[PDB]
């Protein structure tokens, strides 16, 4: 199904069942359905911690570098996975969301202390 | 046949399966036109209760009414299924007892 324009993208295709998500990392045309036809499978991502308390992420780095070199784009969740792996730099919003979380918990710690002080 | 002949004729072709009186459907809806009794072919003897219905497909057919006693009348709705009445020639439909206007057989 030739699309009008478009391009290849490395993104997450959702699998699994209800309440049990599992992602396949695929290179596919951006206009294709999320879970439909793809060009190549480049890895997988299990977001649920396993018995060892680990989130397993498989990355076919050789083929990921190939498809980026062929003009493939990256979805935002995929960019953050590569940042966590050390393959890319940390995404600007992973850094900013971390700072927001620090300011949020710095206010809660301050509110908690003010309440105990009043007590 | 030889290998050359088998190659030339190709694989066998099953005869296109014929559709029965239900036209390949589990059941059909019908409207009762009249009731009557039929005599079975020898060596059986009985007055088997039947009826002529107008099927939802526009075709009219004779249907056997199983069980002891019925209360079907003209202009009533019935559901008909497949299955031939072995000793009634030409009767290939059966009324479903307990559906639409045809109720279940009354106990004893």
């Amino acid at each position: 199904k030739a699309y009008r324009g478009g391009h290849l993208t490395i993104r997450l295709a959702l699998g699994g069942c209800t309440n049990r998500p599992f992602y396949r990392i695929v290179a596919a045309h951006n206009k294709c359905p999320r879970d439909g036809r793809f060009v190549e499978q480049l890895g997988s991502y299990d977001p649920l911690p396993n018995s060892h308390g680990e989130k397993l992420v498989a990355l076919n780095l050789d083929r990921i570098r190939h498809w980026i070199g062929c003009g493939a784009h990256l979805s935002k969740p995929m960019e953050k996975l590569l940042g966590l792996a050390g393959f890319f730099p940390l995404h600007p919003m992973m850094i900013t969301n971390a700072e927001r979380l620090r300011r949020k918990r710095a206010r809660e710690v301050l509110l908690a202390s003010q309440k105990t002080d009043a007590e | 046949a030889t290998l050359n002949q088998m190659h030339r004729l190709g694989p066998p072709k099953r005869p296109p399966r014929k559709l029965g009186p239900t036209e390949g459907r589990p059941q059909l809806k019908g409207v009762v036109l009249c009731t009557f009794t039929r005599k079975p072919k020898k060596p059986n003897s009985a007055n088997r209760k039947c009826c002529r219905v107008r099927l939802s497909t526009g075709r009219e057919a004779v249907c056997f009414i199983p069980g002891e006693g019925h209360t079907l009348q003209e202009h009533q709705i019935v559901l008909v299924e497949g299955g031939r009445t072995q000793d009634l020639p030409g009767v290939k439909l059966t009324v479903v007892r307990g559906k639409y206007d045809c109720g279940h057989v009354q106990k004893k």
């Binding site: 069942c17 049990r20 599992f22 499978q41 890895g43 997988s44 649920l48 076919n60 | 030889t2």
Partner: protein, 168 residues
């Protein structure tokens, strides 16, 4: 029983026993043989036993036979470059003919081994998908990972039906 003499020829096992896989240059293979004569016996058995095996391994190579056109049997190959390779087969047995063409125009065991390996790269063991393409369909099949809810119900805390209930 199966019709004809030597019905073993009409089995997939026999047809796959051919060891001649032509190089990409071979495009046509003509076979000239005689129906009678003791010196053309090996060429007749070659047409009878081996041509099916050659065609099976080389489906895109044209093979055409010719009967009693010349005094002696011979094979001729037409290559993509325009070169023609004549092979005189009079007095040779059908096994010697197969070994000859394999040496001059067949792929060696090394070239064939490599091709088989490049095929195995198409079915990566780590990929998940239908059984037709992958070993495993879902990560839930891997021991230690959270199993499928269809077999082991998830804890109430990991279900949206009760996450929204508590939050709402």
């Amino acid at each position: 029983p199966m019709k004809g003499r030597f019905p073993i020829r009409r089995t997939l096992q026999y047809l796959s026993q051919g060891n001649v896989v032509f190089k990409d240059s071979v495009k046509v293979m003509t076979v000239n043989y005689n129906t009678h004569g003791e010196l053309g016996e090996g060429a007749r058995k070659f047409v009878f036993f081996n041509i099916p095996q050659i065609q099976y391994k080389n489906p895109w190579v044209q093979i055409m036979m010719f009967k009693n056109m010349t005094p002696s049997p011979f094979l001729r190959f037409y290559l993509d470059s325009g070169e023609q390779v004549l092979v005189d087969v009079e007095t040779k047995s059908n096994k010697e003919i197969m070994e000859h063409i394999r040496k001059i125009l067949g792929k060696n065991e090394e070239t064939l081994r490599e091709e088989e390996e490049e095929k195995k790269q198409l079915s990566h063991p780590a990929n998940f998908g239908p059984r037709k393409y992958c070993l495993r369909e879902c990560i839930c099949e891997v021991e230690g990972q959270v199993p499928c809810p269809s077999l082991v119900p998830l804890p109430k805390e990991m279900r949206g039906k009760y996450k929204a209930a508590l939050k709402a």
